[PDB]
Structure 1
């Protein structure tokens, strides 16, 4: 009866998202899909006990099965250690996975006709790809010479570059780098994303300023395009072009959306996440780690565990947490699984669940944050929204009807 799903590496998480995650599987995934699930408990109470081995095991499993779906997890800080009696302030589970699997992170917001966009003209989502987190910075305490050097590993002559001669007083200095392989893995991930979506791709740099550094990004993309993708792109009526960041900002805002934007100097936490957080649309933002093979993906919600809401849930208070970015972690993983397995039944299910989600909201049934995008952050009434469990139920009902009406 159920749809064959195939091999999927699941990762359980923490707090409010963990609550939502189970509701998704129980009400939206499992009644219709039978999966070869390879579940890992990346909850903090199990990550500490297993000495963050569950995190390492989860990562190797995604490499093996090619499809990973991750719940949001608590990234440990000093204050969290007192709450769980933590044996160590462990690494970020996402940092660990990214270091193991590699690849480019692509962000995408979920668009609904009745939910205003920051730029009203955006009817189709904009997808942003990006690799200062690698920088080595320090204080210069007084006069002296700061130099940056390259020492070949083969014993040949080191090359010296003067950064600055501080004649009077001190200041600050830093060194940054990028590996050709990382730039190549980013070009491949971006060209494959544009083909898998049927949208054009743009790369933005400041190669007029950082002529060598950014010039290398522009040349690598172009080299990979012309030799491995130009024909495949031209046979989909789409394209690839390099843009200076200034022209790209303006172009993006005058656009209708529906393009891929490979952004070199990009701070996703700020330019996407913080803007989304301030706009009140974090619950509608998705993230997908796309490895250079074109086979390995790890899909997740761009947001965190939603701690504030989880506390109200513990304190017996009613919550209205948006589950869409969480559902879309599942739908994006299942869509990629279907692509690999040539599974038309699974490809349809992933498509139908995304549509039910968009359609329910468009029909007037939504969580508090979505109601706030319409009415204004402080202007929501209880009658404007459905709570966490109420919304999941409405999605469930609409998913049933939609799947029954599709046979014909």
Structure 2
């Protein structure tokens, strides 16, 4: 009798990540959880064959089922169009899914204490959140004034601001905007993420330079905090504070981690989760590529050692949310247990070649210092079997 997992939208991907993704399901997920699985093949050949229809259907399935877990995919370039003889240079599946779903992206680096970090003092993870893409830019052919005007719907408080009077020559100009609703959705997603993980939240802004534009972000976060989150933040002993981007960077340099950083906006050790405005829909993926170099080694029968942590944490993050929506304690436990096993295995000295190279330096790595992809996956599977057995 396995854990009833419920409805999960799964997206298969490309190259080396496609193989590790199958290994994750076969050795870590399917032996313990049964799912009403909505599988979508986002491999480049299948996106080409279906005229990218499979991507739009996967995005539609995440809207309906609320939980998506996605494998890394190829975003075609000129070189990829010739390799697969593609009909078109298809847009990024991540971009297509992101535009259909909307929300805030939270990036979380997975911390293993024996694996070096950018800043050595980082002991707890840092979560970066961000909601520009709709700016109106143009070329200014020569001298003349560029003005930006606001005309209210009634007509009454109309204002015209001089952006610049070009005099010596031309250049470029652009108008940018941010709707209140977008700032409020980002603020709510950030406060909720901070309470879910139990860490303080910091919003970074440049309000000393953009007093009006960034000033509105700061005020909206401060108002939303004082109105509906400070009582829950005080209860869990966490806080919200604004920081100037230059100040925030210096504070992160002297920090030990353990916070959410909201911005106005080893590689296999980071996840990206899209949290939709409805507070119910989530899409989790590994924040890395398809590992082409390792895939070429695999195609030549050579032994590979590819870090699967980010892809495992896409599964655990998705299953953790699926368990929270359904109130499934068994699933919530399984998701947390797989994350613990993944970190415990690496911290105990069992890791892939790339992690061993971070520690020793590539020229110093011996075969005995690491496990190949299959050996690491089997080591995790043995530790997971033990962790789950000692729970029942």
Distance 1:35 1:169 in 2: 64
Distance 1:378 1:140 in 2: 54
2:303 alignment partner, SS class: coil
Please say which of residues 249-258 and 20-29 is displaced more in the overlay.
249-258
How far off is 1:46 after superposition? 1.3
Which residue of 1 is the match for residue 213 of structure 2?
213
Distance 2:258 2:248 in 1: 14
1:383 alignment partner, SS class: helix
Distance 1:180 1:113 in 2: 41
How far off is 1:309 after superposition? 1.5
Deviation string 1:47-84 (CA, Å, 9 cap, x unpaired) is 12222121111112111111110111111222211122
1:318 alignment partner, SS class: coil
Is 1:13–1:71's contact at 8 Å kept on the other side of the alignment? Answer: yes
Deviation string 1:275-295 (CA, Å, 9 cap, x unpaired) is xxxxxx111011111112221
Stretches of structure 2 lacking an aligned partner (at least 5 in a row): none
Stretches of structure 1 lacking an aligned partner (at least 5 in a row): 266-280
Distance 1:107 1:34 in 2: 28
How far off is 1:167 after superposition? 1.2
Label 1:155 to 1:82 Cα distance change in 2 as closer, same or farther (>3 A). Answer: farther
1:47 alignment partner, SS class: helix
How far off is 1:132 after superposition? 4.2
Label 1:123 to 1:166 Cα distance change in 2 as closer, same or farther (>3 A). Answer: same
How far off is 1:156 after superposition? 7.4
TM norm structure 2: 0.95
How far off is 1:353 after superposition? 0.5
Is 1:9–1:58's contact at 8 Å kept on the other side of the alignment? Answer: yes
How far off is 1:171 after superposition? 3.2
Is 1:192–1:294's contact at 8 Å kept on the other side of the alignment? Answer: no
Please say which of residues 31-40 and 136-145 is displaced more in the overlay.
136-145
Is 1:110–1:125's contact at 8 Å kept on the other side of the alignment? Answer: yes
Distance 2:220 2:35 in 1: 39
Label 1:190 to 1:132 Cα distance change in 2 as closer, same or farther (>3 A). Answer: same
Paired residues for 1:252-291 under 5 Å: 252-265=252-265, 281-291=266-276
Label 1:214 to 1:23 Cα distance change in 2 as closer, same or farther (>3 A). Answer: same
Deviation string 1:352-378 (CA, Å, 9 cap, x unpaired) is 100111011111111111111111244
Distance 1:109 1:93 in 2: 22
- What is the aligned residue count? 392
Deviation string 1:222-267 (CA, Å, 9 cap, x unpaired) is 22222222222222121211111122112222221111111114xx
Label 1:141 to 1:231 Cα distance change in 2 as closer, same or farther (>3 A). Answer: same
1:283 alignment partner, SS class: coil
Label 1:123 to 1:169 Cα distance change in 2 as closer, same or farther (>3 A). Answer: same
TM norm structure 1: 0.91
Please say which of residues 315-324 and 22-31 is displaced more in the overlay.
315-324
Which residue of 2 is the match for residue 169 of structure 1?
169
1:95 alignment partner, SS class: helix
Is 1:16–1:305's contact at 8 Å kept on the other side of the alignment? Answer: yes
Please say which of residues 345-354 and 173-182 is displaced more in the overlay.
173-182
How far off is 1:197 after superposition? 0.6
1:121 alignment partner, SS class: coil
Deviation string 1:171-204 (CA, Å, 9 cap, x unpaired) is 3333332222221111111111011111111111
Label 1:386 to 1:172 Cα distance change in 2 as closer, same or farther (>3 A). Answer: same
Distance 1:256 1:240 in 2: 17
Label 1:141 to 1:159 Cα distance change in 2 as closer, same or farther (>3 A). Answer: same
Is 1:185–1:291's contact at 8 Å kept on the other side of the alignment? Answer: no
Is 1:324–1:357's contact at 8 Å kept on the other side of the alignment? Answer: yes
Is 1:139–1:172's contact at 8 Å kept on the other side of the alignment? Answer: yes
Question: What's the Cα RMSD here?
Answer: 1.8
Label 1:382 to 1:154 Cα distance change in 2 as closer, same or farther (>3 A). Answer: farther
Label 1:57 to 1:166 Cα distance change in 2 as closer, same or farther (>3 A). Answer: same
2:364 alignment partner, SS class: coil
